[PDB]
Amino acid sequence: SYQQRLKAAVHYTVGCLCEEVALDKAMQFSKQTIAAISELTFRQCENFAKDLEMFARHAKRTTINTEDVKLLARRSNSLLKYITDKSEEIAQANLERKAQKKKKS
Amino acid sequence: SYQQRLKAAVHYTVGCLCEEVALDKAMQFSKQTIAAISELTFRQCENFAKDLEMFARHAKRTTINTEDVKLLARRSNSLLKYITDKSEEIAQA
Amino acid sequence: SGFRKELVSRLLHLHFKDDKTKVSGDALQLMVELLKVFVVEAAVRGVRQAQAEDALRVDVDQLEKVLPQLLLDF
Amino acid sequence: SGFRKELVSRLLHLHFKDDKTKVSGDALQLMVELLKVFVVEAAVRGVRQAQAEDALRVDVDQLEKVLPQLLLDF
DNA sequence: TTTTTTTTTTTTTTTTTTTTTTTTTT
DNA sequence: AAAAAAAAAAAAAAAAAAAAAAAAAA
Numbered sequence: 001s002y003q004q005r006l007k008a009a010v011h012y013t014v015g016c017l018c019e020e021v022a023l024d025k026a027m028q029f030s031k032q033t034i035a036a037i038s039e040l041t042f043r044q045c046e047n048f049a050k051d052l053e054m055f056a057r058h059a060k061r062t063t064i065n066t067e068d069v070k071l072l073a074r075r076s077n078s079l080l081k082y083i084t085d086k087s088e089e090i091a092q093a094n095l096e097r098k099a100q101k102k103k104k105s
Numbered sequence: 106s107y108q109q110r111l112k113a114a115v116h117y118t119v120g121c122l123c124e125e126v127a128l129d130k131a132m133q134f135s136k137q138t139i140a141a142i143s144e145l146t147f148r149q150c151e152n153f154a155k156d157l158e159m160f161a162r163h164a165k166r167t168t169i170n171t172e173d174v175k176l177l178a179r180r181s182n183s184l185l186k187y188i189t190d191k192s193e194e195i196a197q198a
Numbered sequence: 199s200g201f202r203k204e205l206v207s208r209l210l211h212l213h214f215k216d217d218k219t220k221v222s223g224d225a226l227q228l229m230v231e232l233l234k235v236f237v238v239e240a241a242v243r244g245v246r247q248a249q250a251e252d253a254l255r256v257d258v259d260q261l262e263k264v265l266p267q268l269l270l271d272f
Numbered sequence: 273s274g275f276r277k278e279l280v281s282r283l284l285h286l287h288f289k290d291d292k293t294k295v296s297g298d299a300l301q302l303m304v305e306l307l308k309v310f311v312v313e314a315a316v317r318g319v320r321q322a323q324a325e326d327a328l329r330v331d332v333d334q335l336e337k338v339l340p341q342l343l344l345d346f
Numbered sequence: 347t348t349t350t351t352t353t354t355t356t357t358t359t360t361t362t363t364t365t366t367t368t369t370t371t372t
Numbered sequence: 373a374a375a376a377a378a379a380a381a382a383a384a385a386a387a388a389a390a391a392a393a394a395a396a397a398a
Contacts, residue, residue, distance in 0.1 A: 350397100359388080
């Protein structure tokens with residue numbers, strides 16, 4: 001079904017990420033651990049999604065934005081720092097978009 | 106100290122509640138289990154408090170309301186149903 | 199048999215960062231109910247663990263085995 | 273190497289209660305980054321657990337030992 | 347000097363553009 | 373699995389319509 005294939009796609013990506021950690025840390029992950037992380041990640045998306053939608057809704061928006069996500073990642077301070085960094089970078093990638101488009105000025 | 110008294114009050118109530126469960130199910134709890142639940146409850150309150158305050162503040166309110174609490178209890182579905190029912194009941198008073 | 203409202207109020211006020219913070223009466227009532235559910239879940243889950251491992255009573259070993267999932271659930 | 277934006281979009285839309293909800297591009301980008309951090313944390317924490325108990329590889333037992341705190345952190 | 351007409355100057359409404367977010371197809 | 377188009381909403385300019393200032397009479 002639809003969600004089965006979404007789980008498989010998550011498992012694939014989780015496998016790649018865990019492979020990178022494994023190669024970096026020189027310690028193997030069992031196939032079972034990879035599968036467990038994939039399952040947890042899929043399940044965690046349900047909680048993320050509902051919360052994000054409530055945060056957006058809460059501020060009378062239909063589109064979830066960066067502030068909602070940063071709010072979601074509030075829980076560990078190392079995490080919060082990481083995310084904000086990434087956002088400004090992503091915005092910097094956005095500037096390039098302005099450079100691409102022709103400017104009347 | 107202040108926190109010691111609060112923990113004792115929590116322990117007393119936890120003891121009450123566990124005693125009620127024990128008498129209902131006809132199985133005893135050790136004194137250590139009672140104490141550990143009281144300790145866990147006290148520690149859990151730190152997490153609950155900070156989250157509730159962030160939920161309220163995140164909506165630009167200074168007073169935490171029932172919606173923040175129901176949001177907090179979002180995690181198990183039987184618990185969420187339980188909570189909503191109780192909210193309507195309290196409102197009936 | 200459960201928590202008094204005044205008790206739950208004192209417990210929470212111990213931990214607020216902003217001393218401005220107050221708690222509405224209805225919110226306080228719901229918290230009294232929530233704390234009962236937390237304690238009873240811990241107790242009931244411990245009993246199930248003790249039963250499952252065929253122990254004579256609920257001991258700290260069983261409680262400890264039930265804590266991880268309890269905490270995720272709260 | 274991490275999540276595609278389109279993948280994360282589909283995963284979230286599976287679960288929205290209100291079908292009206294959409295995801296802005298910047299928000300979507302941050303979520304891609306956040307999910308990577310989640311997965312890498314799980315992996316890295318599992319490796320630390322396996323090392324700590326002197327295991328030859330990161331098995332499910334170690335992962336399970338690392339889940340409780342991971343979940344509290346997210 | 348006052349009160350509406352004619353040219354320039356201003357105003358709001360519709361239509362079309364111009365971007366933003368998600369989904370399809372090879 | 374990636375890239376571009378299709379779908380939908382947003383935003384800007386062009387067209388239309390009225391009044392003020394300046395001119396012209398009674």
